[model samples]
Target: AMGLKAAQKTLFPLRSIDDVVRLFAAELGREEPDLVLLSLVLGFVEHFLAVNRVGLTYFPVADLSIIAALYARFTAQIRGAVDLSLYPREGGVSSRELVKKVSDVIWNSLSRSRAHIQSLFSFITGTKLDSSGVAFAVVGACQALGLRDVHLALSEDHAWVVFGPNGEQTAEVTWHGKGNEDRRGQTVNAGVAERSWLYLKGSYMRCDRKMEVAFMVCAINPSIDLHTDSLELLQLQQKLLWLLYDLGHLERYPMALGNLADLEELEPTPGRPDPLTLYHKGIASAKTYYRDEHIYPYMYLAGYHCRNRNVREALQAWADTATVIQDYNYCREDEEIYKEFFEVANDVIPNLLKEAASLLEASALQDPECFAHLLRFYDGICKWEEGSPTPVLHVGWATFLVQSLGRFEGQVRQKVRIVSGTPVLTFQSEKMKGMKELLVATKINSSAIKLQLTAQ
Candidate 1:
């Protein structure tokens, strides 16, 4: 019976956008094309969200449309090569002729109701068509689509459509360099020229293609303010920390580490730290943080796989991130600290671990060598921490563990001594040379520890 039902369902024709709108309009006994299109598009979006396993948050519809259009246009332009077999004709008509006919039908459908389509496009792309009205429209659309959590980011030239229950970015459209030259207004040239100039000034210019549309969107957004004040410094620090945490959760350790470096450039005193100093500090800080929260989890999982010795499965699991431990921020206010910790623990950690576990489970079926390597890696970590404190020395010991597990572990660990409470680390040969100098010079308490240590 199930097989027969499935066969029957397979034969049913899928409804197109137009058919869905027409049906909706008929059901309401209304002939309003704009209303029908709006309802239909929203219905499709809701349906899309319901079916996909991934989380979908309410983004500005206009932004989604803009992205869809850009992707569609780009894809069409690049991969529109003609294939004669796909366009078989009743007679000996040329393949080019058949392809053109198909293209015309698609184009006509899109252009038929330009105003309605453009309204949708504007919603997604951040194009202005009465901001007040559009804001209400977007809110209504999101409600219709069953999107619960939506956040707005407004810039002079464009807006951001942050989706997800907690406002993760799913899709974004920047209006900075979109559409024709005349339509974009006074700032069009400035936007274009500035983006081009930026590319030229940086290594990104090496690529011949235009800058990514997403990047241009970010560029057009108002610069996040960075003032020379303690509050500003703290805010910047928090932002950097959050970004680093998120990146590390995604197993994008290198970039997460890079952001930490950028964070260090914000002058520890008041002036900006030099670039070299910033890079060094960032690397040190990121290593310390990541080693404690991210790498340790991987190490633990690696050990588990080695015990099983499902080489292929173990290797795959080892490559994937199974879990991420949250980092403790000593500097944040007491109230703020728990909120950050909760977010990572309750939200990010579970999701990452689940993904890693799934990947490892899949790989174990086929690769024994991979499994053995992972087991050895895990064993190495266990050996390193044989005599050290579990939480404090976990990261430091895991360094040697991972080295023993992998054939080519890079210079992942740099040994440096640090004091007990502060974020500072001393790389100089003398134990606490910098701390000592600062203490003696300032006449601060000699017993006070000025730096804290964590394994990265």
Candidate 2:
């Protein structure tokens, strides 16, 4: 009854944003908190606002008084649905069986045949649940069952669970991608070794309850349309993100930081870190935790600068994004990132080229470092395409490269010299010292690239 009583005090009589934050404050103060309660509260509130736009700037919880009752009812329902006999109270069942039984309850109870089932509230309605929602429900149910070992495992696009004596055990509690056989209840295998992006090359995030809360915060969507949004919902999301940020829950969450940064971009909070600072921290988090395998952090900043028309910063951001992609071999499943790079090269770069070429005396075409950055950007993409069976570059890319290279004056372009040797040499300015070091490390095919530039 300890956990039950806590949920009662935290969730019952949910009234305002202050009430929600108080719940987060009190719950996050505890070691384990209540994952199911938190997920349900956030998801249900968002759904409430999404369905009824009565809250444009001011959301009254009086309208949502049913939230507390519904939250309690679902809590009891999940607790009652799981069979205690199969899982047992003591050491009778193995950890895998413990996780599997809880997973089976959530999985078997859902009707996966329906479409548009992307919300966590779907678990309440029992009509349908998206892939991540299913996995999230499983972890929440595990928490409800007093199993702290089971945690949500997240990749860029998918989720599962990890639990065991030492947390080495992984299981796919939800389906991933359409038409693919559901590997529900099976151990997460093969995809990691195969270097599939779905598994993130074994760098998928394993969430503690705090990190799980961060995911819930990240899942908040306030936009009603391109022109309209629930202002109260947006405000709530920003405040909750700031709350999590202050509590240090967002330190290793790159996407969450990026999400907060995007919100910050929309409205500059008083005395808070600027959006660029948040973006940089997101990139740093990816570097520190995810082996820099994630691309969205850099892409997020790249898109930010691109929209703001900060050419130098945008170019540099794309260059950094390219280097991260350089480490991965392209696969069919990696089409999203492929489209991102394709848009940058074919669309974004072309749109930026005229401005890049015509910036008075300080033009990107004249800046040797800018020219080197452009080269490094293309070099990284080329490296990504090298070992993959599916080719990335095509005739359109060839045309774009030739035209882009032509924009740079011969004198400025010649400043960057390429030589065939152990280390790829460049005669660009001293500012390019850092870039030269990376070139040598990647061992870029200097002769071939040099040959292409010479012909250009």
Candidate 3:
């Protein structure tokens, strides 16, 4: 035999020092994990227990059957979002619960400390709590969750678990006491949520308290449709999509609580409470992007409500936008309510064109005067040179008759014909009796336009 041909094997499997790598590989489900990585993980677990010392880790017996039974509860009931099946529940005295169960114990143990996260991390990392200068708190939680698809709101702020298609289904962990500084407001407040263009029809709005989320870990990977498009998967995806966004992207939103009575926004409707809700959330995303100055979000929302025939709410968004801009001509968004006129019109015109006189009859029951100066008009203009995009823009210095129709709507005239040149449009609505009607020059092509209002 060459040198030493295999030493005697242990009676049990994967229990010794050499057995760890293979043990972890079998437990983790893939290529062997590095022993160094294992030690760091193991070291942190040991360190956490030594310091927290609330559990059986401090127990004095050789037999650990007592600890195994305690951790089994987490495997079953503890917030389904946290999964620890990776490690052995009872590998027959072969090994103690590794990362998954160990971390779970750590989370359960630390709950009593109830100390500030920074206090814990500052102790763990040997740096000042806040001065750790990064989201040190996320590391411990990530460690606690077994480190799979775990995410932090801003990492520097808060940490929470995310559910994937293959994720466990269980009761969500109910968080008690608000998160100091960043963890405030629960998941409904800013724990975590998601958004996506592909998956839209689900309760993305409802915060399932069983699951925890960090605010600002949004992800909209539409390609999720590629691997599996089952209705169940998509339905779950819709919930995940917004759940990811609502939590991840909407952090730092200006919030009002206590006296601010809220609405049930999960079931969205055209009129009642949503437009206002959408505006706040929409603008929050804008600020998160540092594109707070962009008006398109609120503007698009206005058109959205209008399309539902909820004109009252539609106008409310526009009015708030106008008021904010006028109140401060210089702000993150507003002052260019130009597009507001036509987009509002885009949504308004179709319903109006569908029926003219009848629009007044039922008129969704609003008085005829309410319909007097109406149109969810988002924006528009005239420059014989129709812009490449739609709502035809005014050619720069083209002397183009641009600017929105303030309080007017017009029908396209069949009598008019296109010419080789751009035409000059003059608005003399006050004095003119016979005037050539102006039609909104809308155009579109290509498969899509990203929130391009394909809805209206």
Candidate 4:
């Protein structure tokens, strides 16, 4: 009975990727010096398994050997599945060619495992797999490998991947279905692609890497030192941190705060430097690398801390962040950041407040509805701060303002309505306004839920 109990304990359930890593390391022998390489390879395999949801029932070791073997077998089968003539091999083709080749591989693989892939997609996304998903997955994986400035061709049925140094076409690939004639190689929104890439790279690459190391240290033995300082490793860590910061601003606080406590303790540098300063430095580094999209998250972090009453911390963070933005100075002088600064200043400075108030009073003479909406907006802010739902009055006021602002088309006007007593904001637009109505309603609820709305 004692021996059976010990054996049962050894057969731990694989709840996380870490569990798989630990099991594999144990099977492979822990004293191996190439643990870091093995761990990195395992992390990639774990990601593949997670995304595909198909792994061998049993494997000898959960290491690079297994990954290599799987890739080798899959590649051989995939090669025979695609049209070989489409892929022109020469001394060198552009990055577009590489992306196309990879995309073809993905498409062929999906075709071979159509039912299984579709099932996996449905399980993960709660919807059928579309071209967007295939494009998203490939682009996401490339971004994880630090490839940016890629292009995509996507339709409802299929997707093609392309890459280049300066948004030029170098490679192409189709992952699923026939390409749409109307939307071939269409450029996807940069913002959408960026956010998706961040999600995939952060969750699957960086977090998984750290989790694997931590698991080994905890479950197997304490002596194994998996150094987490490679350039690739550091980039992954930074990307994950930035991703969390961005998601927090997007009101995904639950997901954002999940890793906050652990990440807060991480001194990515030797010295226990302030997180704010480190964040600012990261923004600066990103700018140096021509990564403009990341700057907003650091700025938003400063704003977040400021709103939360950590004035000193917020001020320090803002100053550092400002220095980076100004030093880089990539944006135009009359950019949105400057406008935001002016708006925030009007609230913070007495002189600016008086000027803004006077301007508001003057504008009210010409636009009574605008004045009403402005007041309601302030009321909503107040309500939010007091932890009350924004009153229906504000929604009504906004609806009036929208109509007054010449934005109230028959569809739009009908969509905005105030339901008395209930927190729901209703819309009754004439066109296909269901989605717009839901969006507006959601916005009202989200804003109201955050702060109470009351007239001052």
Give the candidate order by descending lDDT.
Answer: 2, 4, 1, 3
RMSD of 2: 5.6
Q: Pairs clashing in candidate 2?
A: none
> Model 1 over residues 1-456: C-alpha lDDT tens digits?
001123222322323333332332332332111221332244233323222233333221323343334334423432353343564444322232432333332232232221122233333333223322232233223322223333233321233333343332322222223333332112123322332211111111100001111111111111223432223223333343433243233122332323333334433434544434433343344345334222323333333444444344434434332212111212111222223333322333334334545676663222334333333323222222223223322233333322222221112111122332231232221222333333222233323322211222
Kindly indicate the candidate among 2 and 3 with the higher lDDT.
2
Full-model lDDT, candidate 4: 0.34
How far residue 239's Cα lies from its native spot in candidate 3, in Å, is 4.4
- Model 4 stretches astray by more than 4 angstroms: 1-65, 82-86, 89-91, 95-105, 111-167, 170-184, 187-262, 265-272, 291-295, 303-456
Comparing 2 and 4 by lDDT, which wins? 2
Off by over 4 Å in 3: 1-249, 252-278, 284-292, 315-348, 352-357, 362-456
Worst 10 residues of 4 by lDDT: 198-207
**lDDT of model 3, residue 291:** 34
How well does candidate 1 score on lDDT at residue 110?
A: 32
Q: Please, what is the TM-score per model?
A: 0.18, 0.84, 0.27, 0.34
Model 2 lDDT at residue 226: 61
Q: Report lDDT per candidate.
A: 0.29, 0.72, 0.29, 0.34
C-alpha positional error of residue 248 in candidate 3 after TM-score superposition, expressed in Å? 7.4
Name the weakest run of 10 consecutive residues (lDDT summed) in model 2: 422-431
Best by TM-score: 2
